């Protein structure tokens, strides 16, 4: 199960369409069990489970529909109808799926995640991502400055523009922030339902966690 936790740290986040809201979920599945972390962007919830709990809980939820634990796990790896309740702070996540042409049930018994995993799975990665993204901004801004030194050499001796629509204004970073903060930040920083996060950041998430 230690390897299940290690896989989990380095899994990306998926996005789940409930009827009631959406969730973010990262999951790591093997034949050995699973580990899951879930969030609604206000709270975070954790479960880890081995094959013992799989065959017991599946035999409860699905009385006569027998399998080895690993075949259930394999199907969850495919990943259906999602519903949930917070009962106390069990985010019980209830999943209806199709397998074998039969309806299937799993319930995740997700407790409030520890502050330590919230740090390791979100805060530290998300921080590390913001610093790394800022170094990318810094390297695109050096690259933009380098292309201006290049283009200014043309402007310094001959070299008129032909296509009257290719002009760039000289790149300056403070003013590129100024315009972004008014025109782009409202939309771009919006959390929404977490679909923006899962759509464009998961590569950096995977890289920063593995760093």
């Amino acid at each position: 199960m230690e390897e299940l936790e290690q896989g989990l740290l380095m899994q990306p986040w998926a996005w789940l369409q409930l009827a009631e809201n959406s969730l973010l979920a990262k999951v790591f599945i093997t034949k050995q069990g699973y580990a899951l972390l879930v969030s609604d962007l206000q709270q975070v919830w954790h479960e880890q489970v081995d094959t013992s709990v799989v065959s017991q809980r599946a035999k409860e939820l699905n009385k006569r529909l027998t399998a080895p634990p690993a075949a259930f796990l394999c199907h969850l790896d495919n990943l259906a109808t999602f519903s949930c309740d917070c009962v106390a702070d069990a985010l019980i996540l209830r999943v209806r799926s199709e397998l074998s042409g039969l309806p299937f049930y799993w319930n995740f018994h997700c407790m409030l995640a520890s502050p330590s995993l919230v740090s390791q799975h979100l805060i530290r990665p998300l921080m590390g991502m913001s610093l790394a993204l800022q170094c990318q901004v810094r390297e695109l801004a050096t690259l933009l400055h380098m292309k201006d030194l290049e283009i200014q050499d043309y402007q310094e001796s001959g070299a008129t523009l032909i296509r009257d629509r290719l002009k760039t204004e000289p790149f300056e970073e403070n003013s590129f922030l100024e315009q972004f903060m008014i025109e782009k930040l409202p939309e771009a920083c919006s959390i929404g339902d977490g679909k923006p996060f899962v759509m464009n950041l998961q590569d950096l998430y995977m890289a920063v966690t593995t760093q």
């Binding site: 075949a71 209806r96 074998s100 042409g101 039969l102 309806p103």
Partner: protein, 144 residues
């Protein structure tokens, strides 16, 4: 009324061809009588309206859709994709049947059979209906 004979193999008995006979009043859903035989012995039992409902509810499926699965399993209505599996102890007379997918079998239902006391006689009936049914589809053919 409808009946439907279907030929099967029990998992217990690779080389014996068995015959499943089902008999009911157009909706299988209303309940049915069911016979198994192997040309030497016969077994029977019955299934009812609330038992099929219950079986579908335990499997969380729309009744009628579950009845679809039943027609396909019990009335030879299987496609090439569908692989059904048939199991019986004669000793306990417990029938059950299943579908195979995900590289696994999945129980679809179970029956209490009773060994039948007059084996050769329900066999007689069964195969008379077959001789008739072959002869009808033959006389229809000649006409077409």
């Amino acid at each position: 009324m409808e009946r439907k004979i279907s030929r099967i193999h029990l998992v217990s008995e690779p080389s014996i061809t068995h015959f499943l006979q089902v008999s009911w009043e157009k909706t299988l859903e209303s309940g049915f009588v069911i016979t198994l035989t192997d040309g030497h012995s016969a077994w029977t039992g019955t299934v009812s309206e609330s038992e099929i409902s219950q079986e579908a509810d335990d499997m969380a499926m729309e009744k009628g859709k579950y009845v679809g699965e039943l027609r396909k399993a019990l009335l030879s209505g299987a496609g090439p994709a569908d692989v059904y599996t048939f199991n019986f102890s004669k000793e306990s007379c417990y029938f059950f049947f299943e579908k195979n997918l995900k590289d696994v079998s999945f129980r679809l239902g179970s029956f209490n059979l009773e060994k039948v006391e007059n084996p050769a006689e329900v066999i007689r009936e069964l195969i008379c209906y077959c001789l008739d049914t072959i002869a009808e589809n033959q006389a229809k053919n000649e006409h077409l």
